[PDB]
């Protein structure tokens, strides 16, 4: 196999036998084959749009297909085989539509050679063998490989955010068109300038998509607000919801109301605690445990059903006993875990089985007590603009440190905790995404009532951090967003973090420190381009990085 899309890739070069995440060769190769089929759909979909007869019938299939190949999202080979079969059928329908339109417009049959992604076909018996030759290493030129894979990785992060917006009824034609432009481009031989322009275009589409998801979430469930979240437990059995989808949370809360089953969040569902629509349910207890990578022991000790709405689902350890109470939904899948089917249009998902099972379970084991404060998304922060600006002017807040991003297992991530603990006491950390779990349970206090850690939400709520920065730029009358007293020391793990990074690069942010390591999918020449144009840097020691950031460098 060959996969190198997440921060934990083997040796920082690529996983070749079994993923470090646990992804076996057969699963990795099937994900490559699904992406190959998506490029085929994109070739014809792009041509139909160019001929003036766009077909948007595969929009959701394409977003879900890309999302299913995100790190820790779907482990069920049967799901991938089904998606590949369905994608071949969808591709063929687009091909037949294209051939007729091309002939009508040109007065002759189409006869230009097409990449194999547009024509290869087979039943499911042929998939395992074909998958081995349509992987990442089929691109021989290292620079072309790096630019194509950077684009696809960024694109799958954008697709995830767009799928959440779509679930809530929010969509933009430009996003779905770009999905096919970007996928089809990886089957073409383009110049370096063209390839880099597509990557920057993906960063601009990441801004569009994060803005759309921000609108979707806040219009539907209200603007997040300051909230004190309990991290201890109640006395009833509960259901633990993890991942990012807030519509699944809305339905779970409604279906569990009055049943004697409590609702708890985990990981990236922590920010559901900040929304006014969900704060009205007294049975919504709080947030359980920490970061996604500690879920084996935490899902175990939770004792009740666990619902994964999105990635990060980690394979069970041999001694784990919660497979019979593990539920997947959305693009998530796992062999032997019960899956909650998609909601009918205008209807809801059916969580009754989780509720019936939870009534047979003991209450969660308390793993800690106290609380976490959060809910500092853009509306809430801009509502406190005068207080924030005055603190910056008085010198009470000397600098902001954006430490948003994604957490991971490697020991080198103690750097983020130590940076948080060692930053001067007149600095405020801004965060979003599960990178927050390295420092959101510390006792850093506040600065005149402003918490020293301000959690804006999920990794998509890095959007709010950009809105805040842009507001500060205008208030302070600065010509360049980089001249604000803000430093960026971002942690990454999977592909949604890559989309966030590309969005910040599109917004003109320079000097970002990215880590705990730099991506394996950046070749030496591509990495040099990023350093030349954007001054992206690796992490150094805690002391060196704090000193540099306090100097604005
Ligand atoms: S998702 Fe990450 S750890 Fe898993 S196979 Fe790919 S690069 Fe390796
Ligand atoms: Xe790039
Ligand atoms: Xe604030
Ligand atoms: Xe802020
Ligand atoms: Xe602000
Ligand atoms: Xe990020
Ligand atoms: Xe960010
Ligand atoms: Xe962003
Ligand atoms: Xe920004
Ligand atoms: Xe900011
Ligand atoms: Xe990244
Ligand atoms: Xe990047
Ligand atoms: Xe390059
Ligand atoms: Xe880089």
Nearest-CA residue for ligand 14 atom 1 is: 527
Tell me the C-alpha distance between 349 and 240, whole Å.
16
Q: How many domains does the chain have?
A: 4
**What SS3 state is found at 530?**
helix
Nearest-CA residue for ligand 10 atom 1 is: 469
361 assigned binding-site residue? no
**15 phi-psi bin (left φ>0, alpha ψ -120 to 50, beta other):** beta
411 assigned binding-site residue? no
Beta bridge partners of residue 488, listed in sequence order: 402
Segment (H or E) for 389: helix 385-394
Host domain of residue 349: 225-375
- Tell me which residues have their CB closer than 6 angstroms to ligand 7: 402, 404, 462, 465, 500, 504
Q: Are 206 and 354 in a shared domain?
A: no
Tell me the C-alpha distance between 34 and 30, whole Å.
6
**What SS3 state is found at 213?**
helix
- 281, 261, 278, 260: which is closest to 269 by C-alpha? 278
- 549, 508, 503, 545: which is closest to 400 by C-alpha? 549
Ligand 3 centroid from CA 384, angstroms: 5
SS (H, E, C) 429-490: EEECCHHHHHCCCCCCCEECCEECEEECCCHHHHHHHHHHHHHHHHHCCCCCHHHCCEEEEE
- 32, 67, 36: which is closest to 158 by C-alpha? 67
Contacts of 457 (CB under 8 A, 6+ apart): 224, 271, 274, 374, 375, 377, 432, 464
Ligand 14 centroid from CA 537, angstroms: 6
Choose the final residue of a domain: 139, 167, 185: 139
Name the experiment that determined this structure.
X-ray
Q: Given CA atoms 104, 54, 500, 435 in this order, what sign does their dihedral have?
A: negative
Number of Cβ within 10 Å of residue 446's Cβ equals 11
**Residue 514: DSSP 8-state:** E
Look up the CATH number of the domain holding residue 256.
3.40.50.2030
Sheet holding 338-340, edge to edge: 284-287, 262-265, 238-242, 306-308, 326-329, 338-340
Q: Are 311 and 405 in a shared domain?
A: no
**Residue 373: DSSP 8-state:** E
Q: Are 355 and 206 in a shared domain?
A: no
Tell me the C-alpha distance between 365 and 301, whole Å.
5
**What SS3 state is found at 121?**
coil
Q: Are 403 and 546 in a shared domain?
A: yes
Q: Are 366 and 396 in a shared domain?
A: no
Cα–Cα distances (Å) from 298 to 101, 195, 286, 512, in that order, read 56, 43, 15, 33
Question: Do residues 373 and 228 make contact, with C-beta atoms less than 8 angstroms apart?
Answer: yes
Q: Are 135 and 147 in a shared domain?
A: no
Tell me the C-alpha distance between 417 and 439, whole Å.
5
Q: What is 220-275 written as a DSSP string?
A: HH-----EEEE-S--SS-EEEEESS-HHHHHHHHHHHTTTT-EEEE-GGGGGGGG-
Look up the CATH number of the domain holding residue 205.
1.20.1270.20
- Tell me which residues have their CB closer than 6 angstroms to ligand 5: 381-382, 385, 388, 468, 471-472
Q: Are 217 and 232 in a shared domain?
A: no
Cα–Cα distances (Å) from 327 to 319, 334, 339, in that order, read 18, 9, 6
To the nearest 10°, report the CA torsion of 90, 92, 97, 102. 130
For the chain, state the CA radius of gyration: 23
**Residue 344: DSSP 8-state:** P
Q: Are 417 and 497 in a shared domain?
A: yes
Ligand 3 centroid from CA 379, angstroms: 10
- Tell me which residues have their CB closer than 6 angstroms to ligand 4: 381, 388, 454, 468
Number of Cβ within 10 Å of residue 84's Cβ equals 24
Nearest-CA residue for ligand 11 atom 1 is: 498
What does the chain come to in residues?
Answer: 553
Ligand 8 centroid from CA 206, angstroms: 8
Ligand 10 centroid from CA 359, angstroms: 44
- 145, 148, 141, 112: which is closest to 39 by C-alpha? 148
181 assigned binding-site residue? no
Choose the final residue of a domain: 179, 207, 223: 223
Q: Are 3 and 121 in a shared domain?
A: yes
Tell me the C-alpha distance between 70 and 495, whole Å.
7
- Tell me which residues have their CB closer than 6 angstroms to ligand 10: 400, 430, 465, 468-469, 472, 486
**466 phi-psi bin (left φ>0, alpha ψ -120 to 50, beta other):** alpha
This PDB structure is determined at a resolution in Å of: 1.8
Q: Are 345 and 425 in a shared domain?
A: no
The response to whether residue 153 sits with its C-beta less than 6 Å from ligand 2 reads no
471 assigned binding-site residue? no
Cα–Cα distances (Å) from 494 to 156, 293, 500, 535, in that order, read 10, 12, 11, 21
Question: Do residues 338 and 306 make contact, with C-beta atoms less than 8 angstroms apart?
Answer: no
Ligand that lies nearest to the alpha carbon of residue 449, given by its number in the listed order? 3
Nearest-CA residue for ligand 2 atom 1 is: 196
Ligand 13 centroid from CA 19, angstroms: 27
Ligand that lies nearest to the alpha carbon of residue 210, given by its number in the listed order? 8
- 358, 353, 315, 362: which is closest to 334 by C-alpha? 315
Tell me the C-alpha distance between 13 and 10, whole Å.
6
Question: Do residues 223 and 380 make contact, with C-beta atoms less than 8 angstroms apart?
Answer: yes
- 259, 288, 245: which is closest to 358 by C-alpha? 259
Question: Do residues 517 and 412 make contact, with C-beta atoms less than 8 angstroms apart?
Answer: yes
Distance in Å from the first CA to the final CA of the chain: 40
Q: Are 210 and 234 in a shared domain?
A: no
Choose the final residue of a domain: 100, 117, 139: 139
Q: How many CA atoms lie within 13 A of 105 on its CB side?
A: 13
The response to whether residue 492 sits with its C-beta less than 6 Å from ligand 11 reads yes
Kindly give the pairing relationship between strand 486-491 and strand 399-402. parallel
Q: Are 511 and 426 in a shared domain?
A: yes
């Amino acid at each position: 196999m060959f996969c190198f899309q997440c921060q934990e890739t083997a040796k920082n070069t690529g996983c070749t036998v079994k993923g470090m995440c646990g992804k076996p060769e057969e699963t990795a190769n099937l994900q490559d084959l699904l992406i190959f089929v998506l490029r085929g759909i994109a070739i014809y979909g792009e041509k139909l749009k160019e001929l003036g007869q766009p077909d948007r019938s595969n929009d959701d299939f394409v977003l879900q297909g890309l999302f299913a190949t995100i790190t820790n999202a779907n482990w069920d080979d049967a799901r991938f085989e089904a998606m590949i079969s369905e994608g071949l059928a969808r591709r063929d329908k687009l091909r037949n539509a294209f051939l007729a339109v091309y002939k009508a417009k040109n007065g002759k049959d189409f006869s230009e050679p097409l990449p194999e992604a547009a024509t290869w076909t087979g039943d499911s018996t042929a998939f395992a063998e074909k998958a081995k030759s349509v992987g990442i290493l089929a691109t021989e030129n290292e620079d072309v490989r790096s630019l194509r894979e950077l684009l696809i990785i960024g694109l799958k992060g954008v697709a995830a955010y767009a799928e959440h917006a779509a679930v809530l009824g929010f969509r933009k034609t430009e996003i779905d068109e770009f999905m096919l432009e970007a996928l089809a481009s990886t089957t073409k031989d383009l110049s370096v300038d063209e390839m880099v322009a597509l990557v920057m275009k993906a960063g601009g589409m990441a801004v569009t998509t994060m803005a759309l998801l921000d609108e979707a979430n806040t219009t539907t469930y209200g603007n997040p607000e300051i909230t004190q979240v309990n991290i201890g437990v109640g006395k009833n059995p509960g259901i633990l919801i993890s991942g990012h989808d807030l519509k699944d949370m809305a339905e779970l809360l409604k279906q569990t109301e009055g049943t004697g089953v409590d609702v708890y969040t985990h990981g990236e569902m922590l920010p559901a605690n900040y929304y006014p629509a969900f704060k009205k349910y007294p049975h919504f207890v709080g947030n359980y445990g920490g970061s996604w990578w500690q879920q084996n022991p935490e899902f175990e000790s939770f004792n009740g059903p666990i619902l994964l709405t999105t990635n990060c689902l980690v394979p069970l350890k041999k001694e784990n006993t919660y497979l019979d109470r593990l539920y997947t939904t959305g693009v998530v899948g796992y062999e032997g875990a019960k899956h909650i089917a998609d909601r009918p249009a205008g209807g809801a998902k059916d969580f009754s089985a989780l509720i019936a099972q939870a009534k047979k379970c003991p209450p969660p084991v308390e793993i800690e007590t106290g609380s976490i404060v959060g809910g500092f998304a853009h509306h809430q922060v801009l509502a406190l603009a005068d207080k924030v600006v005055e603190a910056v002017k008085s010198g009470a807040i000397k600098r902001f440190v954006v430490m948003a991003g994604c957490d991971g297992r490697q020991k080198s991530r103690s750097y983020y905790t130590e940076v948080a603990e060692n930053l001067p006491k007149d600095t405020v950390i801004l965060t979003a995404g599960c990178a927050k779990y390295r420092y959101n349970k510390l006792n850093l206090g506040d600065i005149g009532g402003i918490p020293r850690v301000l959690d804006a939400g999920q990794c998509n709520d890095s959007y709010s951090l950009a809105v805040i920065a842009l507001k500060l730029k205008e208030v302070f009358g600065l010509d360049d967003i980089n001249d604000l007293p803000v430093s960026y020391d971002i942690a990454w793990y999977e592909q949604k973090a890559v989309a966030v990074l590309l969005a910040l690069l599109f917004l003109g942010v320079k000097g970002i420190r990215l880590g705990p390591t730099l991506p394996a999918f950046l070749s030496p020449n591509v990495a040099k381009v990023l350093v030349e144009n954007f001054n992206i840097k690796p992490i150094g020691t805690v002391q060196d990085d704090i000193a540099a950031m306090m100097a604005g460098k």
